[PDB]
A paper describes a structure:
Cilium assembly and maintenance require multi-subunit intraflagellar transport (IFT) protein complexes: IFT-A and IFT-B, which form repetitive structures known as the IFT trains. Powered by kinesins and dynein 2, IFT trains shuttle cargos along axonemal microtubules to maintain the steady-state ciliary length. IFT-A is also essential for transporting key membrane or membrane-associated proteins, such as GPCRs, ion channels and lipidated proteins, into cilia. For biochemical and structural characterization, we co-expressed and purified the human IFT-A complex, which contains six polypeptides: IFT144 (WDR19), IFT140, IFT139 (TTC21B/THM1), IFT122, IFT121 (WDR35) and IFT43, with IFT144–IFT140–IFT122 and IFT139–IFT121–IFT43 forming the “core” and “peripheral” subcomplexes, respectively.
Author numbering:
A (entry chain B): 1 to 198, 219 to 227, 246 to 745
B (entry chain A): 1 to 44, 59 to 276, 283 to 393, 408 to 457, 471 to 490, 492 to 577, 584 to 945
C (entry chain C): 1221 to 1342
Write the structure that this text describes.
């Protein structure tokens, strides 16, 4: 989690309420006696609307982007329209506490200290209904059928569109816990209802619930947040708070909750109420904590008059080991996805997952107060039944988390610490400058290897069972995204200049450099293959050859067999590597065994035939046999068998074989030249007489006329 | 997207029909009569011609199938609702209901069939479950209803007033906002709906957020809107009293049935509002539409007749190498599923593609024209689906024409040429031309300012041969450019608007199928005094065509349900088939039944691939059958062609003439065949030659069985060994005896180990390499499997010296097993490395001990300076630890 | 599996040959097939030319030859006339039938088509 302050601007009075234009273009405040209209993109104040005569307490758009109401302490409500002109007005007997718009029917509901009034757009008068006590909150249901009124008595009256009190929810404590904020869960099918949108005249005044799955979040002044169903039954227990809440809201799809108030800060919560983190730290009470209608942006208005516009950023927390990929879903769950069978598995942690480390039959999840260690037990390659192995209960501070069979590794500054699964600390390594990267490179269960890179530029290998770091390299610039070849014979480094340097780990010599790399992955199955993404383009290298770059959205997480695995916005994706390009690159260099190794990863049959024929012309009969077998051409297989047995019996001329291959493909001319060069014009004559090309046989009548 | 009337069913006694409902899952057609008549029918001509006359006096107005649970429901003008179930192959009334107030205006089942809403004229609404009143029967208000429809999730339930207002409801009598009608703005008089259809996505959506719901009014204007829209595809029709609306089964075509003032019409539209044609039904007046389950046939009620129209949709298919590519949408995933069904190996390759504007094929390649999140993509793919090259272009790839070494993607106002191959890889020369640019012989590179000028004569179709590029425009004008370097050579200005274009191999003539399906021929080079001329071969209902890759004169076409083949404007006998020409080559036509495949897209049978032989090949084969080889050979020599020569040679080989076969191989210039026949003649036994020839044609199992039956396990083994069937070699070696079976079985086991290891399938190759005796590869399998215990066992099982032990010790050093590496090196007799690894792995005790044993004594300085460096780092404790490990206890 | 089973007299020899490999091997001579006159190794019995199994000389085990053909008068098994004659100098019985066989009983056969007839067509 991380929130960046896009813009902050201070008014001259407490910010009472805020409202967003549904398009998100502009927002509206309620500061003192005027309505400030701000541009969401920048924060430049457009217009102070000057309709009311006293303090403005509330404001709300109509979910249609055509009108918005505002009630004030002057005991009046003014309905403005877009383009910011006041077109309608009416009055109450008291200061208007809050006003809201029906999400579907645009039926305005404005409450006050004594009564609440409903007004349809086509209605010619305001229907006033008396209330038990002072109302402070309005919350229309998503379908627009019910209205929840939170009151100063610690009571919520849920009423229909007419005003009849359908149900009454009594928060414990009565007047001990005034109800200061409420909000319906906005996650329903009706959320998409209005996503396809396209002289002040005073108005007179005229004085089942069981099968529905609706959640009302309630922010009391007994310092608790409750969640109530439409039937009055509560959902779960309360969430004890140490501050008076003043604003409870939701994101666009109702996945997270925003809570502010007596604490001079704003907090993000799960939809269940588990605290996730801090959005902003303010200097006064946050009186409103709304969020942008369709983005991660949030806007916070406090009593000091400050308005702050944060952009919430969620960090990708994930691990990958070969064919398994665990990531953080919904900020509290861990999803382990198989990269072959695509059988996802969800693990509920009920707490903010901080770090994830995955390994063969091991899954470490660093919860804010503990680390959960999960294991696989069935001996199946596709087993996906993770059970809890251990719970290391300790408030951990670590830069990186890694997990090995029977061990856990914590990276913290220059300290690389090795703990058991029961929390016991076994070993500790002190590093040179600062650990930037760490990765398990396999090994025996309790004796595994670790590949460490430092901001010093130095790259080390640390074995869990011994207390000494083996120096692999001392680079020039810092290290990032280390990876090691499948055979542990080659290393690949990214060094803060996007320059992928590949080193021969045993001779300390580098092999090549590439100028744009943000992520590197060696093929776990083909040693020569390399992948690296940087600058929005994929790259696939075969040995020391040119690249075959694509466009890409995201960064490379893995490269297994013939599939790249890239992450784009918490979404994994598989790119199918074109094996034919490295195959033909190896072929042009007359490297047939390596071309076959690349082809075995999967190509078409035309490519297989092309490799077979190029091997034949190149006189590599083993690779030619294998490729032809994968095409199953008995003609060419029997030709190669005949050539092999002729070679076995003693024939050791490498031009007769090429002449035969050319004659057998159908050249009939280069084959004749090869036949003559190898000292056999008789074979060329036989070829031309068999083909009945007698005009060419005259050329190869070299012997003369001895019959 | 073509359409033609195909059948007719005259209802007896000339009663008027007021409703046709084609059951989608089962091919049942329910027809409502004007005098109490109600009939259930089924095709394949009728199979289940039924007269469900139980009840239903007066007239019959509404008819709805329940799909799941297969329950028909029918209503009178007297309000008698009857629900019918299929019992004992006949339809019997199951439920009967009668509300005695008004007439049922409409009925509709839920998206899952568990709930039904019926709307009356007096405003009463009755909603029932499959058995009884589910929730409510509401009396509503002073309104007259005409329609009813559920949503995808069955939550909203939108009605239609008699005065022309659609009201959105709650799944109860709770009135939500009235719908905002955007299609009618300038209308003035009274408006009635007459047609509402919501495509409950059940075969996927053509676009991830395509318009689904569709409303039309009797005046003629329609809006295709998603949920409750405010801006939405608007359409204007000349349909006076539009009679009906029907979505396709995939929701990709909308059929609007009405009649202009002028006469009956069934127009077709795309979900985004693009027009597609007009059917021009005979008779007095239409009454209802109903698509088939597969959307291929549409039944429409005209007077006392049920006219059937056959429909050819726009399938996204292609043929590359031996692979049929075909794309379809599915409910679960929001992107197109494209199957690269390789017919040669009966393999499938499912890809998932987001945009997928088009699929085009040429040679062993396939261009998928797609829309990305450099806004549009052209993915160049292999025949097995692997994307070789995604090329990002900006203009819309509305029309894609793919020649080998060129790809032309044309929008309505420009075309883009990209060379993707060389006659052999990417030599990209990307160019963009506006249609009215008249490019010169050659040239600006990637100048995209030409795609925004706009034109009054848009592009309708494009094609490109190896030499020329033909752009068809909406006025009938075609423009011809030189393809390798685009330059405007000629303009022709044909008669009718072009839909499909094709060029023969000579690029000398062009076959044009217009929008109405009429096929004509243009001769580009035939100069009359003008430049090009027509050819007077107008056909009527053509919907597919293909030239030969070999013969300029040879042509193939599909008209309605028959395939015709033309040799220079001379048609042959038709072939009753419904398929798409995958290939026309070597007197052979390969076609596929996409209509059958796309009904079961998961499992395409090989029975759907049909091969035809044109008159020449069929005649030669039949003459070979009737008279002996000797005379058919003379006939084929009179009319020579390489395909016929190869057929004659293979027939002779089957008969084992070995003389006619050799001559016919000479005719084909087939040296492989000549050599094979010479080798076969050198062989001196029948049933040896028969085995050889049955191996020649690829009947490997037949050849193996033949060799076994003649008591030759040797030659069966040899045949299996020339091929790669090593499992077959193991199976055969299990029985009988051989000259050298231990070596043969070891070779088989090593080869299977290689077979599994080349596919990265260790723990299967490890099973072999052990029954066989392979060491070099077995160590690699253990290493990649990280079975270091196996590596240790292998290293201790090897002899004292070996070429593999040093490699094993290096592997051990890399993984970090000092002890096993030291033992392996000492087995190699390389103590120097055995101590260098102890130093490297910081096992100084072993290093000093081995120095004392093997007399190196150079590690004292190593320890001294290592400890000096450690002390320089203030790690005195580490120095003490090493000095204790190295037994330098004094220090 | 076969380790720790070589005769103690020969373990030294076996380990000596393996430790210093000697790939030096004299090539086996090639002789014609009796059916198609194809040159194949003397000890190879399946001819790659005619795909026919070749009878083996009961004296040497080599495949039979047309120009050195003979048969034991007792067991009617093929044999190489020169090779059988040379081997009979030190053995007084047929190697195959274990019957009393002298050198004089061998008659060189010129027409061996009786023994070269394929069983399928005969
Ligand atoms: Zn032979
Ligand atoms: Zn004998």
């Amino acid at each position: 989690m991380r929130a960046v302050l896009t813009w902050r601007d201070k008014a001259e009075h407490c910010i009472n309420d805020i409202a967003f234009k549904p398009d998100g273009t502009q927002l509206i405040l309620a500061a003192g006696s005027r309505l400030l209209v701000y541009d969401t993109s920048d924060g430049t104040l457009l217009q102070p609307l000057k309709g009311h005569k006293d303090t403005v307490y509330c404001v709300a758009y109509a979910k249609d982007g055509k009108r918005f109401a505002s009630g004030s302490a002057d005991k009046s409500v003014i309905i403005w329209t877009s383009k910011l002109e006041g077109i309608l007005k009416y009055t109450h007997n008291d200061a208007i506490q809050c006003v809201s718009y029906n999400p579907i029917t645009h039926q305005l509901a404005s409450c006050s200290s004594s009564d609440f009034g409903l007004w349809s757009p086509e209605q010619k008068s305001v229907s006033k209904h008396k209330s038990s006590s002072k109302i402070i909150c309005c919350s229309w249901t998503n379908d627009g059928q019910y209205l929840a009124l939170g009151m100063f008595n610690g009571i919520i009256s849920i009423r229909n569109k007419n005003g009849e009190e359908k149900v009454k929810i009594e928060r414990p404590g009565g007047s001990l816990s005034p109800i200061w904020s409420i909000c319906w869960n906005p996650s329903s099918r009706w959320e998409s209802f209005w996503m396809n949108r396209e002289k002040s005249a005073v108005y007179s005044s005229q004085g089942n619930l069981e099968e529905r799955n609706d959640i009302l979040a309630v922010a009391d002044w007994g310092q608790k947040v409750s969640f109530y169903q439409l039937s009055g039954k509560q959902i779960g227990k309360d969430r004890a708070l140490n501050f008076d809440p003043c604003c409870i809201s939701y994101f666009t799809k109702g996945e997270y909750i925003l809570l502010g108030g007596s604490d001079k800060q704003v907090s993000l919560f799960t939809k269940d109420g588990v605290r996730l983190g801090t959005v902003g730290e303010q200097n006064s009470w946050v009186w409103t904590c709304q969020a942008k209608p369709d983005s991660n942006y949030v806007v916070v208005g406090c009593q000091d008059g400050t308005i702050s516009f944060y952009q919430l950023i969620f960090s990708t927390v994930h691990g990958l080991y070969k064919d398994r990929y665990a990531y953080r879903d919904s900020m509290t769950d861990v999803i382990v996805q198989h990269l072959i069978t695509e059988q996802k598995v969800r693990i509920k942690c009920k707490e903010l997952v901080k770090k994830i480390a995955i390994y063969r039959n091991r899954l470490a999840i660093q919860l804010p107060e503990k680390i959960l260690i999960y294991e696989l037990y069935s001996e199946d390659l596709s087993d996906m039944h993770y059970r809890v192995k251990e719970k290391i209960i300790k408030k951990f501070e670590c830069n990186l988390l890694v997990v090995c069979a029977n061990h856990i590794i914590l990276c913290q500054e220059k300290r690389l610490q090795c703990l058991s699964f029961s929390g016991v600390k076994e070993r500790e390594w002190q590093m040179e400058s600062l650990i930037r990267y760490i990765k398990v490179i396999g090994g025996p269960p309790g004796r595994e290897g670790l590949l460490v890179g430092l901001k010093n530029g130095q790259i080390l290998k640390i074995f869990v069972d011994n207390l000494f770091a083996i120096v692999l390299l001392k680079q020039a610039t810092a290290v990032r995204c280390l990876d090691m070849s499948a055979s542990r014979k080659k290393l690949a480094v990214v060094d803060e200049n996007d320059t992928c340097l590949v080193y021969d780990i045993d001779t300390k010599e580098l092999l090549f450099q590439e100028p744009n790399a943000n992520s590197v992955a060696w093929n776990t199955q083909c040693e020569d293959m390399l992948c690296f993404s940087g600058g929005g383009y994929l790259n696939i290298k075969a040995s020391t050859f040119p690249v075959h770059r694509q466009k890409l959205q995201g960064f490379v997480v893995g490269y297994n067999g013939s599939k790249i695995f890239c992450l784009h916005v918490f979404s994994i994706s598989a790119v199918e590597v074109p094996q034919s390009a490295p195959m033909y690159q190896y072929l042009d260099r007359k490297l047939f065994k390596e071309a076959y190794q690349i082809a075995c990863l999967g190509v078409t049959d035309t490519d297989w035939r092309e490799l077979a024929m190029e091997a034949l012309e190149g006189l590599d009969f083993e690779t030619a046999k294998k490729a032809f077998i994968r095409v199953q051409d008995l003609r060419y297989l029997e030709l190669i068998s005949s050539i092999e047995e002729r070679k076995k019996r003693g024939e050791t001329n490498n031009d007769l074989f090429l002449a035969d291959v050319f004659s057998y493909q159908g050249k009939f001319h280069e084959a004749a030249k090869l036949y003559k060069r190898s000292g056999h014009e008789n074979l060329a004559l036989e070829m031309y007489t068999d083909l009945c090309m007698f005009e060419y046989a005259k050329d190869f009548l070299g012997s003369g006329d001895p019959k | 997207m073509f359409f033609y009337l195909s059948k007719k069913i005259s209802i007896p006694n000339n009663v008027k029909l007021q409703c046709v409902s084609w059951n989608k899952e089962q091919g049942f057609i329910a027809c409502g009569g004007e005098d109490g008549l109600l009939k259930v029918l089924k095709l394949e001509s009728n199979l289940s011609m039924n007269q469900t006359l139980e009840g239903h006096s007066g007239s019959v107005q509404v008819v709805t199938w329940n799909e799941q649970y297969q329950k028909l429901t029918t209503s009178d003008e007297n309000g008698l609702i009857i629900v019918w179930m299929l019992y004992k192959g006949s339809w019997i009334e199951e439920m009967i209901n009668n509300r005695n107030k008004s007439v049922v205006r409409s009925m509709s089942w839920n998206a899952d069939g568990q709930k039904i809403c019926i709307v009356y004229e007096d405003g009463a609404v009755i909603v029932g479950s499959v058995d009884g009143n589910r929730i409510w029967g509401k009396d509503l208000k002073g309104i007259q209803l005409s329609h009813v429809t559920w949503s995808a999730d069955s939550k909203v339930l939108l009605f239609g007033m008699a005065n022309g207002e659609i009201h959105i409801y709650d799944n109860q009598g709770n009135f939500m906002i009235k719908m905002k009608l955007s299609c009618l703005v300038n209308v003035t008089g009274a408006i009635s709906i007459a047609g509402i259809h919501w495509y409950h996505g059940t075969e996927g959506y053509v676009e991830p957020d395509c318009p689904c719901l569709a409303v039309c009014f009797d005046n003629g204007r329609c809006q295709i809107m998603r949920h409750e829209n405010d801006q939405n595809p608007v359409l204007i029709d000349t349909g006076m009293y539009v009679v009906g609306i029907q979505w396709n089964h995939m929701g990709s075509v909308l059929a609007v049935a009405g009649f202009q003032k002028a006469v009956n019409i069934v127009q077709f539209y795309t979900p985004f509002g693009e027009h597609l044609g007009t059917l021009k039904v005979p008779g007095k007046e239409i009454s209802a539409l109903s698509w088939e389950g597969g959307g291929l046939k549409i039944a429409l009620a005209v007077d006392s007749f049920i006219y059937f129209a056959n429909i050819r949709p726009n399938y996204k298919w292609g043929y590359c190498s031996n692979t049929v590519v075909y794309a379809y949408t599915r409910p679960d995933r929001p992107e197109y599923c494209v199957v690269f069904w390789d017919t040669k190996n009966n393999e499938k390759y499912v890809k998932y593609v987001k945009g997928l504007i088009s699929i085009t094929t040429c040679g062993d390649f396939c261009i998928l024209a797609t829309k990305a999140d450099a806004t549009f993509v052209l993915v160049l793919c292999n025949s097995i689906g692997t994307p070789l090259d995604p090329k990002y272009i900006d203009i819309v790839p509305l029309f894609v024409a793919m020649t080998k070494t060129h790809v032309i993607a044309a929008s309505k106002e420009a075309f883009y040429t990209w060379q993707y191959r060389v006659a052999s890889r990417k030599e990209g020369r990307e160019r963009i031309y506006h249609v009215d640019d008249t490019p010169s012989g050659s040239m600006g590179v990637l100048d995209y300012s030409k795609t925004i000028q706009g034109t009054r004569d848009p592009i309708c179709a494009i094609t490109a041969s190896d030499k020329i590029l033909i752009v068809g425009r909406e006025s009938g004008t075609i423009q011809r450019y030189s393809l390798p370097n685009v330059g405007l050579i000629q303009k022709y200005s044909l008669n009718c608007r072009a839909y499909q274009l094709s060029l023969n191999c000579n690029s000398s003539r062009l076959a044009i199928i217009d929008i109405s399906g009429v096929l004509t021929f243009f001769d580009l080079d035939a100069r009359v005094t003008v430049v090009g001329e027509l050819l007077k071969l107008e056909r009527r209902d053509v919907w597919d065509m293909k030239w030969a890759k070999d013969n300029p004169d040879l042509f193939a076409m599909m008209e309605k349900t028959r395939m015709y083949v033309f040799r220079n404007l001379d048609p042959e006998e038709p072939i009753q088939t419904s398929g798409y020409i995958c290939n026309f080559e070597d007197l052979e036509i390969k076609s596929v039944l996409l209509d059958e495949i796309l009904k079961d897209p998961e499992h395409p049978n090989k029975d759907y691939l049909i091969n035809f032989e044109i008159r020449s090949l069929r005649d030669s084969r039949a003459l070979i059958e009737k008279v002996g080889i000797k005379d058919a050979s003379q006939f084929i020599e009179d009319n020579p062609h390489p395909r016929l020569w190869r057929l004659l040679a293979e027939a002779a080989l089957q008969k084992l003439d070995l003389y006619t076969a050799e001559q016919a191989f000479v005719r084909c210039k087939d040296y492989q065949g000549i050599k094979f026949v010479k080798r076969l003649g050198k062989l001196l036994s029948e049933s040896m030659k028969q085995a050889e020839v049955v191996g020649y044609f690829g009947r490997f199992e037949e050849a193996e069985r033949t060799y076994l039956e003649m008591d030759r396990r040797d030659l069966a083994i040899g045949l299996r060994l020339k091929l790669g069937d090593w499992f077959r070699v193991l199976q055969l070696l299990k029985t009988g005896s051989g000259d050298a079976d231990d070596s043969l079985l070891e070779q088989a086991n090593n080869a299977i180990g290689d077979y599994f290891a080349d596919r990265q399938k260790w723990l299967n190759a490890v099973q072999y390499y052990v029954q066989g005796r392979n060491q070099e590869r077995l160590a690699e399998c253990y290493y990649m499997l990280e079975d270091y215990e196996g590596l240790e066992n292998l290293a201790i099982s090897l002899p004292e010296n070996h070429k593999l032990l040093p490699e094993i010790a290096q592997m051990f050093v890399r993984v970090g097993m000092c002890e096993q590496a030291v033992t392996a090196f000492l087995k190699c007799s390389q103590p120097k490395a055995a101590v260098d690894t102890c130093v490297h792995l910081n096992q100084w005790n072993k290093a000093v001990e081995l120095a004392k044993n093997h007399s190196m004594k150079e590690i004292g300085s190593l320890l001294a300076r290592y400890a000096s460096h450690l002390l320089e780092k203030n790690k005195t404790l580490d120095a003490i630890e090493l000095y204790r490990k190295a037994n330098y206890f004094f220090d | 599996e076969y380790r720790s089973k070589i005769d103690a007299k020969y373990k030294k020899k076996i380990e000596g040959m393996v430790r210093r490999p000697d790939i030096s091997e004299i090539e086996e001579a090639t002789t014609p097939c009796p059916f198609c006159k194809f040159l194949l190794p003397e000890c190879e019995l399946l001819c790659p030319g005619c795909k026919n199994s070749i009878p083996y000389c009961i004296a040497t085990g080599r495949h039979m030859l047309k120009d050195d053909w003979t048969v034991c008068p007792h067991c009617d098994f093929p044999a190489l006339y020169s090779e059988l004659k040379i081997m009979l100098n030190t053995e007084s019985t047929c190697p195959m039938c274990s019957e009393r066989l002298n050198a004089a009983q061998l008659k060189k056969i010129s027409d061996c088509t009786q023994y070269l007839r394929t069983e399928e067509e005969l």
